[PDB]
Each structure stands twice: as C-alpha cells, then as structure tokens.
C-alpha cells in the first residue's frame, strides 16, 4: 500500500 | 468537574477557509490578509503523483489557472509562488475576517485543534497531538488536504499544521505553514512509513494529575522512585524518558494536588507493571497521552476537590 | 481514515454568545435576533440557592437590573420574561450574526457539540452524548452556566441543550432551549442524583461498524444471534435492549461492510463475555457508546477498505 | 454533597 495525498483529484 | 478532549473554538479559523481549484484537482486553502496558502499538491493530477516535479508543474501554470472560492465569491489570483510544499497565492482582496495570527512550528508531544474541511467548507473540529514520530492520528478523507491545525492564545491564532497526506497505516502527515513537513515525509503517493512511535510520558503524568483533581486516587501508592529508576521502567514499556524539565513543567499540578512528581511516577510505574485490573481512569481503560500539562491546567479547576 | 470524537465547527454559535449579569451573579447567554436566552439562575445569589422562589425573585427585578455584554458593547434590555427555567431578555438590537436556527429537544442516546463558555467568551468545544439517565458527561466549571449544546445540519444550528448545573457525581444537567430540564433535575443547589445509567447499545454497534470500515475485523466471529437472544445478554451487562428500529437504522452501515446487524450483535455478545484480551478497537480499550450511526456515517469513508 | 448551579456568584 502507498501513501495518499488527500486532495480531490479528477 | 469532568475531563474531555477539548478543541479550541474554531470560528476564527472558519472565517479563513477557502476552496482552491487548479484544473480537475481541488482542496482547501487558508486565506489570511491578501494571501491564500495551500498545499502545492493542488497543481497535480493523479498520474503526476508518483513522480511529481512540483517545480516542473508550476512554471507551466499562470495566475488564472488557480480558482479560489470564498463562499459565494471568486477571488482573483494576482500572484503565485511556491515555498517548500505550500503555495502562496496573492489575491486582490484582503480577508476582512483575518484574525491576529502566527505561524508556529510545534514539537512532538504538543497538542492542537484540527478544523477538518472539504471544498473549503469546515465539517468538524477535534483535538490532536503531534506524535513523537511526527505523525498525527487524525480523521481525514479525500478532499481534506489543506485543512489546518491550530492553537488559540487570547485572541491570536497560532497555526501549526496544514494537512497533506495519509500514510499506509492510516495516520496522517503534513507541514507547518511555511510548507516544511513534520517528519521524514514527502508529498508524493509512494511507499512511506513512519518511524516507530513511543508514548508521551509527561502527558500521561499530566493526565494522572487531572484524574486526581477530578477526585480520583485509586492508582496512587505510598512508594516513590528516582528519576533514573523510573526511566528504566519507561524504556521497557516504550515510554519516553522523563527529564527534569518535564518534572519542572509538572510542578504546578504537583503543588495543586500535593502529590510529588516522582510519587506520581511511582504510581505510573505500578500501572505499567500491573495494568488496570478492570478499572478506569477518567473514563478510559488505557493510559492517555494526548493531554499536555497546559491542557490539564487550562481545563481543570484550580482547586482539587480533596 | 481514522476515527475521532468530532464536534461541529463552533463559529456560528460563537457569534451568539453574550454575558448576562444581574447583581453579583454572572453567566452566559445566547443572543438570537433581539432576544437573549439565559438560565433563570442568574437572578439568584448564593443564599437564594437552597430554596429559590425564582418567581418571587423575578417580580422584584426590572429591565435595568440585567446587564448584557456582547464583546465590547452593552445591549439594552427592553423586556424580560421567564419560560420554565430560562429567561428571555428582549434587547433593542438584533444580533447581526444570528444563524438560521431551531430549538430542538433531543433523545437520550443522541449526540451534540458543546461550546463551553465563561463570561460570554467561548473557551472550548467538545462532543457529548445525552446519557439514558438524562445527564451528560461534560467538562464544566463555575461560570459555565448558559453554555449551549447544538448540532448543525447544512447551515442550520439546532440548539438542544443549555447548561445549568453539576450533580454530586460530577456529571451535568441542563435544559432544552425552552427551559425544560432533561431528566428529573431542578435548578437549585440540593441533593439530587441521576437514575442508574445504561450503555447505548445501538451506538456501540455503530462504533464497531466504524472500526471495520477503518480496516479492523479482529472482534468478528462466524456466529450469529437472534434479537431476543442478544437482548438477554445485553440485560445482563446493563446494555439497552436492541429494537428492530435500531437494526433498521444500522442497515446502511451493515450494507457498506457486508456484516449483518445480528452478526455484529454476536460479535458484541462475545466482546461482553470475553472482554478484549489486551486488544483495542479504534484506539480504545473499552466499548464506546457516544457515537451514533449518523456520527459514523458522517465521518467515515463511504467505502470500507476491504 | 449537593448539586452546584454553575453560575459565577459573588
């Protein structure tokens, strides 16, 4: 598993 | 009486939250005077995220590539720059709701209030400690990036955290407000892991004092301990070593309750060795370490209920 | 990911808090439109408190006996009346910061945010549940009387609690915003005690679903149970009996996780009978009952991390 | 012990 940059990307 | 995980009133920070959109990516920004601060990740798409040259992506952007929305109003970006992992977006309108504020970097073991936000709209507030491994055990979903953590002293907001990312273990990592990460983390979607964590010893002791101030003495004992003998037990249980400065910071709580710090340390030694035996302290069945001595003093009565 | 005791952003309520002084007694008031609501205890001195004829004390008061302070501004009281245990003080200025609001009375087992206040100045925010015995486990000191509890839906503040008093056990009692007490309590300093409390079963189950949504299944089992067989265990452990309506309210969480409600009940049965065996759930070593199904859904991801 | 009305009385 990999870190998540918690923006909202489309 | 009573003891709760208490956050600061969030209104002064609510007045500063905005939404920042660049392309198909959106997140939260912090609007103070005529500058909007936000995570530089806003300029990235999903494919950019493994290997982002944030730099390379920014030179390909103009001011009009940044849409800033404050409630019902679009703010015009008139200048942009990158400072470490944050962007500073100069807008043409100063925020009339700007509080007195500071940008402060906190130490592991300190606490702060988090205003969770989505699409520039505040959704919840909760209290957090910076873990010794520079993570925080927050509650954040996609869209939360750019929510801020803070403390309020008198009427000054000391901003200390901007949220960026969630690690594989489900804990969270971010930066101070000049964009410098807490801990060895980077704003890209890669395999990162926090260092091994420890328990914040001075905080546990402060919380034990809070319990006595709230009329509860069941864990106390007639024993004492030297600082060095306690720290030998602390190391066995993955607790931080206690310093004389920590003993000094605990002084006021020690005088209010009449329990010497090293006496409380002996009580903590017993709790670590014996567990709790089905009992609770301030409503918890484990030793709580996310209250600072300042947090206890701020919330508890100045008189101990003897 | 993560799960925290989360309060609502407090700014809309902060804009309504004022200080009310009558004689040498002071407390907090809630200023909505041109009315300030506050506990009628403001008209009492310390000797009045054993046997207050609140009525008898009020007819001996005029409008100018009430000093209302909103920040730096004194508001002029132009009318006063008592409604049950609150006073309504009509002032000559409508609060420009009045949010959309409702006065709602909540049920035991529901949750709400508390804005703790002193001298009309907000000091902290935390999340509370109304206990089945109509008390709340708050954190309140002298001067807190008149602080309010609330929920926010969209941009409407539903006020549900005004704080009055602390019982001998250190728990707290108050009224709705029409001045009617929650539970069998009265605003005088006398020997009052809450009824025996119970654990809010539906809330514990909701919290267990939250834990699974956050990727944790250690407490699950392959057993199931009938509603009636579970309630026979619940009664043994001072848990509230579970109803079909509670099962229905848990439906959405059950569908998100794929765990039937009665299957989760069997898991709770095992936890009650065996304890936790040194393990934790969402960072707690006991079963947490101050999160509603709504609280879980609001805070957790809509996707479960399988 | 007796309940406390948590005003600030002087």
Author numbering:
A (entry chain C), D (entry chain C): 301 to 310
B (entry chain A), C (entry chain A): 1 to 306
The study reports:
Further, we solved the structures of SARS-CoV-2 Mpro mutant (H41A) in complex with six cleavage substrates from replicase polyproteins. Substrate selectivity is revealed using structures of the H41A mutant in complex with six individual native cleavage substrates. We demonstrate that the subpockets (S1, S1′, S2, and S4) which are endowed with an exceptional selectivity are important for selective and potent binding. Additionally, other subsites such as S3 and S2′ to S4′, which have less specificity for substrate recognition, may also be used to enhance inhibitor binding and to specifically target Mpro.
